[PDB]
Structure formats: C-alpha cells, structure tokens
Amino acid sequence: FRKMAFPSGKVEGCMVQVTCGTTTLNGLWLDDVVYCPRHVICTSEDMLNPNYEDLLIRKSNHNFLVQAGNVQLRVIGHSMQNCVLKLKVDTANPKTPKYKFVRIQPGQTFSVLACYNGSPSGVYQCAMRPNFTIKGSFLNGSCGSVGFNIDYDCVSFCYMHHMELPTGVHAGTDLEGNFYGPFVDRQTAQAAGTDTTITVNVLAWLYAAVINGDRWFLNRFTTTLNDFNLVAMKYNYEPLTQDHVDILGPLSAQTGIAVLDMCASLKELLQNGMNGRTILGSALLEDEFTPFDVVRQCS
Amino acid sequence: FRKMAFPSGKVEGCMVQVTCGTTTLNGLWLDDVVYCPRHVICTSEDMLNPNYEDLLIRKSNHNFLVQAGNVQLRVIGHSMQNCVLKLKVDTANPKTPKYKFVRIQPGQTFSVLACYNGSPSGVYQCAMRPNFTIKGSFLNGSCGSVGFNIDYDCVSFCYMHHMELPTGVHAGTDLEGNFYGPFVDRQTAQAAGTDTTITVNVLAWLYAAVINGDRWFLNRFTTTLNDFNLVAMKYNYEPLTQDHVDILGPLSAQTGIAVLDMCASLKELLQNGMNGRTILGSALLEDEFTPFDVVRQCS
Ligand SMILES: *[C@H](O)[C@H](C[C@@H]1CCNC1=O)NC(=O)[C@H](CC(C)C)NC(=O)OCC(C)(C)Oc1ccc(Cl)cc1
Ligand SMILES: *[C@H](O)[C@H](C[C@@H]1CCNC1=O)NC(=O)[C@H](CC(C)C)NC(=O)OCC(C)(C)Oc1ccc(Cl)cc1
C-alpha cells in the first residue's frame, strides 16, 4: 500500500510559462485562457503589501509573456479574478483535456504536478488539511503548479499554488482564485491555526492495513461514537459521524470489522502508542488517504 | 520534502493491453514492438511450473490480441527474450518517446506507472532494494507495468512487473527480460533473503531533513568510516564507502555537516532510537531517496 498519485499526462499538456518583468511562474492553459497567480505582476518590492488593482492597471496584454515550449503565445486580453489572473490568448490549447474546476473539501486528497518554468518536475499526492493547508514540496518558481483529481477521462482541477507559510506548509487557491483558508497573497507572517487529524482517513488506512495482512493492533474491545469522540477531541482528531461510518461501509464490509470496533483499536493506539511496531511500514498514524483512495488502491 | 515521482505522460502513451486466451496484462509499445511478461501465455494451470518454450510453441501471431485504446494492433511476429515476449506489430507507436533500456543498480530509485488493462491507474516512487525486490502496490492484472526514470526528454526504462512474493514485496525484470535477483516466473514460494538498509540514502534523507530545518538529531560527536560500519553491520545497514561519502559531497557542502559527523548522529539514532520524535514527518529512518533525488527535490 503506497501514496499513489494520478497519472499526470493530461495535466502536463496544459502547463505553460508566464513572465511579467523578471517574475516567472507557471500557468494553466485550457481552451484560449491561461490561469496563473496574480502575484506574477509583483516585483520583490511589491510582495510585502501589494495593491494588486493598482499594480495591474500599469500592465498591458503585451507585458505578459506566455511561452508553451519554444512557442510564445499572443495575449489578447487580461483580467483579475480574486487571486488569479486570466490571460486570454489567441490560440486554444490543442491538448485541452476534458476538465472542470472544483473547490475541494478539507480531508480530501489530490495529486500535485510540481512545475518550474512551465515544465513538469514531479508528481505527488496531497491532502487538504482541516486547517486548509497542504504539506507539499514547493520551491521558488513553483507557483501556478496545480492540484487535480481524475475521474475517467475528466480532470477536476482543485488547487493552484501560491505561497509557503512560516511552518513550511503550503497555501493556495481554487481555480477561481479564492484561497483555501484565511490566507492572503502577501509576504507577511500568517498563521494556520491548529491542525487536526482526519479521523475517517486514519480509519480508512487502518482498514487498508488489515486488508494487506497487518492485524496486530486489533483488540477485543469496542466503543461508542460519543465515547470515541471524547478521545478524539483529546488528541485533536476530527469528530466521527455516521456519514463517516457509512463512507467506511465498503471497507468495514470487505474486512468484517465494525467501524466502532476499529475505533476501539484506534483509541488504544492513541493512548498506548505503537510500542515500536509498524503499520503498513509506518510508525505514525497516516491520515492522508481517504476511504475512496483505499478502495481505489486495493481494487 | 515528499516522495515524488516523475511525470508519467511520456510513459502513458506507450501502454497497451495484451491478451492471450483469457489472460490479460499490460504491454509497453515502443516503435513497432510490444514488450510484455511471457507469463501472458500461461493458463492458471500452467503457472505452477510452466515450460515456457513448449507453451509458446503452441502460440501463433494471431493468438496475441493487442489493443491500444479502441484500436486492435496487428501482430506480425513474436519471440521470447528471457522472461519477456516481444510482439512485432504492423504500426509503430506515434507516441514513442526518446527512450533507452537500463538495468538499474540496487539502492537506486525509479517511478512506477501502475496499469490495469493497458490503462494507467497511478504513479509512485520505488527503490530497488539491496535484495532486488521492490515495495510496490500491485494487484492482479498489473503485470507489464513499468518503472522508469526521466533524464531531460529521454525515458530510461528499468523495470517490468511480474510477481509478488509471499512477504508482499514485488519482483520483476529489466526490459530485456532478466529478473532482478534470484527470482523465476513461476508460482512457487520464493525467498528474498535478508534485506538491508541503503545507508547512503538514509544519510541523504538526514541531509534533506537538515536542509528543511529539522536539526534535533544532530550531536557533537563524530566517528570513523570503519567505526560506523561496525555499527552498520550490527543493524543490517550497507557499509559506507568513500564513493558514498563523495556522492554525498553536494549535500555535505550545502549543509556544512561532515559526512562522518552525520554518521555519528545516525549511529546515535540507530542505538537510542528517535525518542518519539520525528524527522521530516517520519518516525522511521527513510532509505528510498538517493542523494540525487534529494538534490533534485531541494533544487
Ligand atoms: C511562488 O513561486 C512562491 C512559492 C513559495 C516560495 C518558497 N516556497 C513556496 O511555496 N510564492 C511566493 O514566493 C509568495 C509570493 C507572495 C506575493 C504571496 N511568497 C511566499 O510564499 O512567502 C513565504 C516565503 C517563506 C518568504 O517564501 C519565499 C519567497 C521568496 C523567496 Cl526568494 C523564498 C521564499
Ligand atoms: C501479474 O499481473 C501478477 C501480479 C501479482 C498478482 C498479485 N500481486 C502481483 O504483483 N503476477 C502473477 O500473478 C504471477 C504470475 C507467475 C506466472 C509468475 N504469480 C504471482 O505473483 O504469485 C504470487 C501470488 C501471491 C500467488 O500472486 C497471485 C497470483 C494470482 C492471483 Cl488470482 C492472486 C495473487
């Protein structure tokens, strides 16, 4: 059982380079529009406290250099939507996949295609944390890299990368430019509050452990939803609900282990630790696989 | 710092479906040749102890059904090379990337494009273990999935998937059909011997930890190559060598931490454990990032 990303090919063909002045980052080219973070228009002396409206007023279509491979695209319009720019170009991307824009929920997962200079460097899987950050791997030049899911042949874009927080975690927007969480695109100290553990995902991963033969942490106790949650709260775990219980249905069925039984084993792990043992090769409790991810992978 | 795979698009366009009888698995379509595991010709009653030469003698070109999307390809020749079949087809793949076949060394890493029915399902990063197994995620139908590295625009194929061992780890071949390790493609119990930890990779990951601000495990001791290795052997770690020390050069330089100093910290971690703390978000010592991987990711 592995952290598995979606195949990235459909997204690779949408990545372009966008330069304004000496600032370069990545853009996403779908039909005749290129989407990118609006801070492409900032100089380093603007990033402390930009007035983006005023900055963009000094920019014309020809100040945006958009490059797809060795091919410069012609910008024929521009507008700002929340924290993203939309650059209308004179060529529709011939590689545009079937796609939609979605705003994901916290606790859900997606794949990131990390890019530099409009060129893909690598792919990995991320969760939107309950505090609306992601634990990514991003350097200078990575902004405009996107996160996505694939359903059949349709790419659902859900994330565009903008910034790193002082804790080393990452923040960004949906493809309409609205940040996940309370963040703003300016280079000031910003707090993500307390993060919490995605309880239903830990359970899904414990189920995945059982499916893959790892069963040592199972005990002979059970518990109640309200009793467990009294333990969840203690550990900054999200409360569990019947919808969670139901979502776990397929896994609880494949394994014959009641969700509340699995909860009792989780309580003991939270209380007693793992005694130097491992679960699916990890010595910590993993919360960045959804139930769907586990079903998808073990099917 | 994340387990990061290569972008998979160039490989996605090489995957096809190969059926012989009711056995279906994946093939790799490059120029006018499709490569796949030879056990595609086995029935379930053949897999216990196949005579592949005899089995293949009863097969003709038209018994191999090769499908790329909705498109059946015409097989015009077939031959067996070690544990792979080469099916000559009448159409050269128009999506063939620049490519080579390489036999990787143990301790090196690569990306796996896990496929079913010739369709990519997901991508993840693997190391060739010192005992020539990989810790993958593979189900029935995944054989013929490949592992690769990308250098610039050139895909270096290094692995084709064939089998799971009783321990749950995975074995397969290079693209000439020669198994990594002592394995044979028959459904009998086979041992991978003792695995060992890839010492230079653990050090590279400790360097990656330091680069990313995690420094608690550093101590004020140093050691000798021979003294450390007396500790390495104790823990089934690979011995460290000057070539390893030199390969770590760039990281030792970026950090100002002598390799033998980092070795002394590693010795203490092996001896004293991690006292419930974490390094790059892991509570175990990670050995599936090479020095190159760490340089690539932190650059
Ligand atoms: C866009 O490519 C870049 C991505 C971050 C750089 C470091 N790791 C990232 O994910 N985003 C920014 O630089 C962003 C622009 C603001 C206008 C929102 N600033 C930001 O993320 O500040 C946090 C710090 C740690 C200061 O990030 C860095 C900024 C500049 C440099 Cl040279 C290094 C880090
Ligand atoms: C090829 O798609 C398949 C891949 C393994 C299936 C289970 N996980 C794998 O990686 N390879 C085989 O089935 C292989 C064929 C032999 C001719 C070499 N047999 C094999 O791997 O045996 C090990 C076991 C655990 C028996 O694998 C399974 C075989 C069949 C089935 Cl239905 C389930 C598991």
3-state secondary structure B177-238: CCECCCCCCCCCCCCCCCCCECHHHHHHHHHHHHHCCCCCCCCCCCCCHHHHHHHHHHCCEC
A267: domain CATH number is: 1.10.1840.10
Residue pair B164/B187 in contact by the 8 Å Cβ criterion = no
Q: Which are the contacts of A292, defined by CB distance < 8 A and separation ≥ 6?
A: none
Kindly give the distance from the C-alpha atom of residue B118 to the centroid of ligand 1, in angstroms, as a whole number: 40
**Cα separation, A259 vs A280, whole angstroms:** 19
Q: Assess contact for B112 and B136: CB atoms under 8 A.
A: yes
Find the helix or strand (DSSP H, E) in which A30 lies: strand A23-30
**Rounded Cα–Cα distance for residues A177 and A179 (Å):** 6
The Cα B240–Cα B247 span in angstroms is: 11
Angstrom CA distances, A208 to A279, A280, B4, B119, stand at 10, 8, 22, 23
Treating both helix axes as pointing N-terminal to C-terminal, what angle do A259-272 and A225-234 enclose, rounded to 10 degrees?
30
A39 in catalytic set = yes
CA angle (A240, A245, A250) in 5-degree steps: 145
Which residue, chain included where needed, has tokens 């020390």? B245
Residues of B in contact with A121 (CB under 8 A): 4, 7, 296
- B153 alpha carbon to ligand 1 midpoint, in Å? 28
> Which residue's entry shows tokens 């002396």?
A45
- Given a contact cutoff of 8 angstroms between Cβ atoms, the answer to whether A248 and A242 are in contact is no
Buried b (16+ CB within 10 A) or exposed e, A117-150: ebebbbbbbbbbbbbbbbbbbbeebbbbbbbbbb
B175, two tokens:
């693209």
Structural domain for A284, as ranges: 199-298
A14, A20, A36, A39: which one is catalytic?
A39
Q: Extract the runs of DSSP E, i.e. beta strands, from chain B.
A: 15-20, 23-30, 33-37, 65-68, 71-73, 75-81, 84-89, 98-101, 109-116, 119-127, 146-151, 154-164, 170-173
Q: Which of A1, A8, A212 sits opposite B7 (nearest CB)?
A: A8
CB A90 within 8 A of CB A76: yes
CB contact under 8 Å between B4 and A114, yes or no, is yes
Chain B interface test: which of A2, A139, A169 (most B C-beta within 10 Å): A2
CA dihedral B85, B89, B94, B97 (to 10 degrees): 20
Q: Which ligand is nearest to the CA of A189?
A: 1
Q: Which of A4, A115, A270 to mutate to test the interface with B (most CBs of B within 10 A)?
A: A4
Residue that has been written with the tokens 């414990």 in this structure: A206
Quick check: B46 and B20 in contact, CB under 8 A? no
Q: Gaps (C–N > 2.5 Å) in chain A: which residues precede them? A: none
DSSP notation for A213-234: T--TT--S----HHHHHHHHHH
- Tell me if A9 and B4 make a contact (CB, 8 A cut-off): no
Amino acid (one-letter) located at A202: V
Nearest to A9 among B12, B139, B297 (CB): B12
Query: CA-CA distance, A214 to A206, in Å (whole number)?
Result: 9
Token look-up 């199972």 returns A218
Q: In 3-state terms, what secondary structure has residue A103? A: coil
Q: Helix (H, G, I), strand (E, B), or coil: what is residue A28?
A: strand
H or E element in which residue A155 lies: strand A154-164
Asked if the Cβ–Cβ distance from A283 to B281 is below 8 Å, we say no
DSSP-derived 3-state class of residue B166: coil
**Is there a contact between A3 and B8 if contact means CB atoms under 8 Å apart?**
no
Q: Could you confirm whether A143 is annotated as catalytic?
A: yes
* Nearest Cα residue to A90 out of A71, A117, A69, A70: A71
